Amino acid sequence: TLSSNPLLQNFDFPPFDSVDAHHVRPGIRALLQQLEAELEQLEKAVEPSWPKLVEPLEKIIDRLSVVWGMINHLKAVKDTPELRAAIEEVQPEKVKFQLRLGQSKPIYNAFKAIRESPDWNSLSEARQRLVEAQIKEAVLSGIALEDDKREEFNKIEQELEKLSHKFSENVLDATKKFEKLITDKKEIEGLPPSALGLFAQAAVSKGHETATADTGPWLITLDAPSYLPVMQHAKNRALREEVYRAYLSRASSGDLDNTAIIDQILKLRLEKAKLLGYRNYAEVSMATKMATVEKADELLEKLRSASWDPAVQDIEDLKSFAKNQGAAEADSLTHWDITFWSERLRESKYDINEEELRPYFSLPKVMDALFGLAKTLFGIDVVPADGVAPVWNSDVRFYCVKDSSGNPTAYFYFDPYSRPSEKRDGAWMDEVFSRSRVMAQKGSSVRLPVAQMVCNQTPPVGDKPSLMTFREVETVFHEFGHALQHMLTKEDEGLVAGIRNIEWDAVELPSQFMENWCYHRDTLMSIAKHYQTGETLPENVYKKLLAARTFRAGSLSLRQLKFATVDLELHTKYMPGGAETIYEVDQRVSIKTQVIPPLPEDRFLCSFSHIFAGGYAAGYYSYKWAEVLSADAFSAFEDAGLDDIKAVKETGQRFRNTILALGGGKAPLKVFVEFRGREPSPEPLLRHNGLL
Template identity: 40%
Template structure:
């Protein structure tokens, strides 16, 4: 295929910012097929044993072509996640096998592997920078973990496994999205929704009207589901929604969305893949590329944290049961009652509700406040610019170096971020950051990074802006931390970019670090404006929020440990079994860890996209692991804060220099040591979570020793 025949294909074009408004499903296959062909040819050239094994001939030459393929496929995948249509899904799935097969072929290419080995043994390697040496070393490890040293027959089977894994994880995601989108409850009697906040009710009415219906439309999307569970006095409705939410994509719902066979197949594929490589389990294989290194170390960490936490979690549950019985005559507190009773307990104890707080967090003001934090900490400027997008609500932000603040000027462009903040049909739930392209020094010129920041907040309601809960604000800051890791990297080589080589259990450090600023008075007061009055958040209300910061932190922490322990034990098995055995293992984990137990019909694994479709298989523990790092990193700001002000540019610059800017150019622990000057400690995490003081527990987990 010639460049001329692809001239009008936006996925094939080389642009700083992609023409997202012009990308159509029919563009995917032609662009991807041609870019695969070109990259395949480049691999064969680099693998020629007659070619001198130099950095320029191998690493740089392959980066030049493979980056174009990766960027085009990233754009296609991103659009498939945020504006999913039948046509786009079909086109994406049509190219998925070819992309999977190609990258598997690269990982199994013995000639290219031998060229990397020769490069590692060369005089050039001995004189390389530490970053380049690390890239070569990581590439060699990647080849080995991709099966390149396997005998031919096993290599072929490994390739088949990799291709099928890509298909299964994609179908898992589609089933969760489709099952969520398929549910809609139209309510005609307003009394059935008694207690639901007025602004949410208006959004429900607008949604029904958009469907040509009267009354109110309730869905399983977060901006709809969560307010009903927290505020609706109709217990029967809460139970109905809880069951619908908890049985999505399972055998208890629509059979065409059932993820049961996919879970069984994926676990079997992962176990076989790991066995071929000589590992005891998928967990053992995955941890080769992570800080923890061994499953046993993760299990010890999780169980130790569970012992420190369980007493607090049991106290949280006891309080819920007490108020449920005394205030609502709920002597048999059920899972669909928990959010409702929790919100009442919070309101009663701290004299405020999440709904009251939400009125102060208008999305435009929150975004402005977030930008102010980033600008002050890291010496940059953020400004919205015009650029093509995939949806009218998406904004594009340019990040530039700060220059003369008095003149309001900005310096050179550092990178761009696309902000896609609102929930809608055809968009995957949750929040995440993806890379469109990473920073790179290319032919003497710095290529700036571009990323996607995606959330699922309630959209604007009529002429009123989107209102965010404080949890939404924390989510936004969290994702901004990931985005900053991408755009503020100063690494010149793609192989050491943050998303390419930072250990998975450290990649949450910047994101969780940023969450801490959501609790600082000077930050919150500057980023709030009441939707009706424009008044900033009152100090008295802030103090009540701060007092409630660790409300049910024991319960929340033990739940995260439950998910993490289930994930690790599941993937530590050499023969995981079928879905029934997966559910049985989950029950065993709950018997050991949990203080609350969902009904037997609840199907958590069937929508656990993190571990079955999102890259967190044998890695969900990373959230808590990295939280130790992030809390300790934030303590560096707290230790020198004056009058509670942690927005300290001098410490921010050190964090930028030692954590964000270095990306994956060195091991994550080395970056932490450079910033903190010592090994990480758990003390700050326990203090921030209100878990410093041990509480008695009625059931103790296994010893961590």
């Protein structure tokens, strides 16, 4: 009877129209039995050959991926509580099997044998990348350690996970300990209607039955949706100072302090690095990155240098502006004022009325322009293919991406319109199938890749089309660039195709790339035509759009560089338990990266959850790294001449055949240099943001 389950079928496109929640529990449990059985069959027959290792392994990997991705996609677009319940129940079993599969010593040893064979030197670059990936994944999880040190390793990992939770609880507890009840209406000046509703119902929840946004008893807290409005809008400088000092000192001292827990984490990370043979934990992280410690250190310093003079200007802009507005805070601005005064200056000079911007951005026009841009640049025709694949909502479109010669390269689904009953908000790209030699049906040489695009516009009603914000357009462009790398991959080795096996810090290249075209004049002014007037976007809106992009770039850059730099400092060159302390790192890096010096009491590290509780340890640089790559990749088109459409096609064709084509079967610095002609520069990024 499992025979009838859609998830267990051999399908050509996933059965999105026909899977219900009651199939999930039986089908995922059944699939996991099949795959567990097929893994054991694999392990009994392993040889260091493609047909006896990598091809069997891909088949397991791929089927779990495709099916799990199907049902998990249905949860984001066709959500029911029965479906959530079913997925949250089988998810642990799934992940236990994933763990099992990677821990396979027969498979590890077989890959190791591939690596050590003479045959290695005949293997293709992509196959070598694949093998090295499997080895490196296994090794860095400890599999290569001998049993005593594997136990030490596992004990280190376990204590680290404990410490990371204790870190996170200390921040969360220190965040929620602050409660400030305002009763005087004068003290609550400036705060928006939303914030006042929040703080009033925050007061109601703590007993103040009558509390109202208007009337008062407003309870202010240090959590994000309370903290942000206070720093941006509370005219009350005392309340701004209050909430600032509290926030920058969560977990700074007391029974709730993280300062020793940090040092513990950093010590155990060093023990982990040394068992794996690396000097420091940054070296371990960088073992799977495009960057290196030295190159990341180099880049971040380059950015910090160029960003600094802009950042001091940004402060003088505020002191100037607040003098104009007559505040006694001017000439005396410090931390709790900056967020506020920035917003005030925003509102004055750089502000764009998004209701008189929406009429110009109509969804069907936007998507046409996007697909036409993709034809111009990359040589592909996006063509309606509605009815080839089954669908979960009548509005979901299905497109074939055809190459220059008329053959399909890839297919994608598009789900445009918001359904807040059943559908997650926002926009995303997701993967349906990867491109694969192995997973091709008989007669075909490759299975073609398949992708999801999703967004969340209000559907068209009457005269009015689905209008978009500029930011929504920007996000659809970004997400289409992930989709394009997934779909226009030419790599047939399927564990390494698409975006698979692209080093984290390089993954956001094609996507951050595609956003640049939204600020490109001629592209934007082709899109931006008023749905009723016909008229292009007014030229003063365009100029303001651009002005807004660059606004506090130097201050912004420096803030990100604080985090990126302290993260590498702490994991590179700090000795835990040694001469210098955590706070001397905190202050020493803050001098280099923060124009107004920290107050004492400011302990930003004790709240820096990203690197102590989350997964960005020795990885926070990654944000700015990918930003550098994408800006620079765009400057190839700037150099070629953005108005010479032959030059844009030539440069785009080469992008198509590098960044988008090669997947993870070539190291990213090699792929980037193959496109760009040289190694990456921060100049373009700095120039586009106005810092050089």
